[PDB]
């Protein structure tokens, strides 16, 4: 039972175009279980989740109602922020928040988080001890004085030390048949001629989960971490992920290279090389 | 379970 529950909030003002947009998506490691969008036509969570829909209607209505209270809070924040930085009313701005908690196999809380960002730049975050703040610039300092004067940290610490943890090890049990699982990577190595004296050796890893993974090449045992092209881990569109590492090799020594794959869904790190046919 | 924030920045 070693995972983490995290929420990613977004509030983007749309002056001169309409009303603000708000999104709040929930995550349990690399699996999204809930989604709250202010553009939704009927509150149905276009991201629903098995183990979530098994809770009553009280739960779904309760969360839906909290989310809407939060759209007002963030609407007040955008307007205050607009003032702290002396911005006009027309400019579109964004406010994002990231909060959650991590747990050990124990099941207990390992650490809690609560960070905010304005227009893509850090603004204010909650400290390791969950009792103090760290304001980036002098505007966040305004929010700092305000929050401690009202002793806001205590409500954040309480959510993280309680609700966050309590509900996590409830989603873990109600979905132990999906959240504690690991899908191993399918791996093969392709060969793509560049010309007469060169050719690319691409190592693929497909259909795995979680997203975490490490692809490494090697030339006669030497790590080629430097001259290796490596793409960003990408979703396949089915809860699974992909990634590939590539190295350029001279036509002929393409047997000296080996690809190494590390992944939780793997019993032991894998070693592979290109095989003609 | 969403956190209910009421204190704006």
């Amino acid at each position, epitope marked *: 039972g070693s995972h983490s529950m995290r929420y990613f909030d977004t509030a983007m003002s749309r002056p001169g175009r309409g009303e603000p947009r708000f999104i709040s998506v929930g995550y349990v490691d690399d699996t999204q279980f809930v989604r709250f969008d202010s553009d939704a036509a009927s509150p149905r969570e276009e991201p629903r989740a098995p183990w979530i829909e098994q809770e009553g209607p009280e739960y779904w209505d*309760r969360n839906t*109602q*909290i989310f809407k*209270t*939060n759209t*007002q*809070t963030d*609407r*007040e924040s955008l*307007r*205050n922020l607009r003032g702290y930085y002396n911005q006009s009313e027309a400019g579109s701005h964004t406010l994002q928040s990231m909060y959650g908690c991590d747990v050990g196999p124990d099941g207990r809380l390992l650490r809690g988080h609560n960070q905010y960002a304005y227009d893509g730049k850090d603004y204010i975050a909650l400290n390791e001890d969950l009792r103090s703040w760290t304001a980036a610039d002098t505007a966040a300092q305004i929010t700092q004085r*305000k929050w401690e004067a*009202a*002793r806001v940290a*205590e*409500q954040d610490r*309480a*959510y993280l030390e*309680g*609700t966050c943890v309590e509900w996590l090890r409830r989603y873990l049990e109600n979905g132990k048949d999906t959240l504690e699982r690991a899908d191993p990577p399918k791996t093969h190595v392709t060969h793509h001629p560049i010309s007469d004296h060169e050719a690319t050796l691409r190592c693929w890893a497909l259909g795995f989960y979680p997203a975490e993974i490490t692809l490494t090449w090697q030339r006669d045992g030497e790590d080629q971490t430097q001259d290796t092209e490596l793409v960003e881990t990408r979703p396949a569109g089915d809860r699974t992920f992909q990634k590939w590492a590539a190295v350029v090799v001279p036509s002929g020594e393409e047997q000296r290279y080996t690809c190494h794959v590390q992944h939780e869904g793997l019993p032991k790190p894998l070693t592979l090389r290109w095989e003609p046919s | 379970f*969403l*956190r*209910g*924030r*009421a*204190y*704006g920045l």
Partner: T-cell receptor
Amino acid sequence: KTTQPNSMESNEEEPVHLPCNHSTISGTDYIHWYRQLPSQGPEYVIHGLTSNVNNRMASLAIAEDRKSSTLILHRATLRDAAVYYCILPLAGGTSYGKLTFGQGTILTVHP
Amino acid sequence: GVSQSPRYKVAKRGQDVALRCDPISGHVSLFWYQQALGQGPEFLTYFQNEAQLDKSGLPSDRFFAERPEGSVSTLKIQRTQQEDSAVYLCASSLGQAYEQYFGPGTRLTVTE
């Protein structure tokens, strides 16, 4: 929604213990207290979450399970005579600050 | 502190009345409450700057509130009825969740 005694008595120079019950409170809910002196507007007294919030004139003690609380005036005076209200403005996250004064408690301070 | 006017008002059943509120300068949030004898104040409407975001407490259509530049606020009542007799309170604050500072309120009485 909270419930508290309709009235309470006390003599000047004495600590006053105003009780309050809030069974369905949330973990994110704050306990606020307001009072209203005769023919005046309501005014803020104190507010807390879990730990005891102390202050010169009034302190607040919150039950461990948080389903009940007490507002503590360390030394009542005639000016302390008024209506006290126990409130949960955030309502578990379903509200934003809007105040729901209930009936409150009318505190009479006898000289 | 917060100011309200008029402090007192007597109205004939059926006429319209206008109450005014001047919140502490700079305060973003502004709330309206209605308090009848022996009862505690009752939420009426709320303002986030100039925008009225919660009017869940307005008894009917007869009640209309505004706050043009997000400062001074007006509460107008059309066709006053006896059930309208109460003290109308006004409170402003730094933000929706911060401590509210109330005004002396307007004591309104509706007679036949």
